[PDB]
Design a protein around this ligand. Structure first.
Ligand SMILES: OC[C@H]1O[C@@H](O[C@H]2[C@H](O)[C@H](O)[C@H](O[C@H]3[C@H](O)[C@H](O)[C@@H](O)O[C@@H]3CO)O[C@@H]2CO)[C@@H](O)[C@@H](O)[C@@H]1O
Ligand code: CL
Ligand code: CL
Length: 167
C-alpha cells in the first residue's frame, strides 16, 4: 500500500529491465536504483538539459544530481564554481562517472543530509528536516522496499512510482 497518504503504483516500461542490470553493473545499489526509478522512467538522461535549471540547481545524470553537490563533493568537479555548471553534463554520457559521483556525494554529506540537498539544494542542506524532504525520502524508501522484497524487480521491466511534487 502507498506511503503516508501519497498516491503510488507500478507499470511496465519496455527495456527497463536491461537498463536496471546496466545500472547495477555500474555499481548501483538498490537505494541507487530506487532514486533513479523515482527520477526518470527509463533511467536515462533524456529529460531537458539541466532539467531546465541553471547554475547550482542544474540537474545531471540519471539521479538528477545537482551541480552544487557535484562540485562540492565529486573529485571530477573539484574547485569549480556555480557558473561552470555545464561541465556537469559529462554525467549525461557516462553512467560509470554518474554512479561514482553519486557515491562520493552520499559519502561527503552522509545519507540523511544528502537527501536534503538532493531534494532541495542549498536550502535543503541548511534546513534538512522539513516535511517535504521527509516525504521525498519516504518515496525513495518505499520504492526501495519494493525492490528489496522481490529480487525479480531488480531486473524486470516494472517501474514503481510515488507522486511527489516537482520543485
Ligand atoms: O543550491 C542551488 C539552489 O538549489 C535549489 O534547490 C533545487 C536543487 O538544486 C535541485 O534542482 C532540486 O531538484 C530535485 C527535486 O526533487 C526536483 O523536483 C526533481 O525533479 O529533481 C531533483 C531530484 O529529485 O530542486 C531544488 C528546488 O528547485 C534551492 O535550494 C535554491 O534555493 C538554491 O539556490
Ligand atoms: Cl544531488
Ligand atoms: Cl529543518
Amino acid at each position: 500500500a502507498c506511503p503516508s497518504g501519497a498516491t503510488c503504483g507500478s507499470y511496465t516500461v519496455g527495456g527497463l529491465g536491461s537498463r536496471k542490470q546496466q545500472v547495477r553493473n555500474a555499481g548501483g545499489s538498490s537505494l541507487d536504483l530506487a532514486v533513479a526509478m523515482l527520477e526518470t522512467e527509463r533511467m536515462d538522461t533524456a529529460y531537458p538539459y539541466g532539467d531546465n535549471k541553471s547554475g547550482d540547481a542544474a540537474n545531471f545524470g540519471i539521479f538528477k544530481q545537482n551541480w552544487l553537490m557535484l562540485r562540492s563533493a565529486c573529485a571530477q568537479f573539484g574547485g569549480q564554481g556555480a557558473g561552470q555548471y555545464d561541465n556537469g553534463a559529462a554525467l549525461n554520457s557516462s553512467l560509470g562517472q554518474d554512479v561514482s559521483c553519486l557515491h562520493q556525494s552520499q559519502s561527503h554529506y552522509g545519507l540523511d543530509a544528502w537527501f536534503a540537498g538532493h531534494r532541495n539544494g542549498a536550502s535543503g542542506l541548511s534546513s534538512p528536516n522539513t516535511a517535504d524532504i521527509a516525504a521525498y525520502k519516504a518515496a525513495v524508501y518505499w520504492i526501495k522496499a519494493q525492490l528489496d522484497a522481490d529480487s525479480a524487480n531488480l531486473g524486470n521491466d516494472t517501474r514503481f512510482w510515488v507522486q511527489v511534487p516537482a520543485i
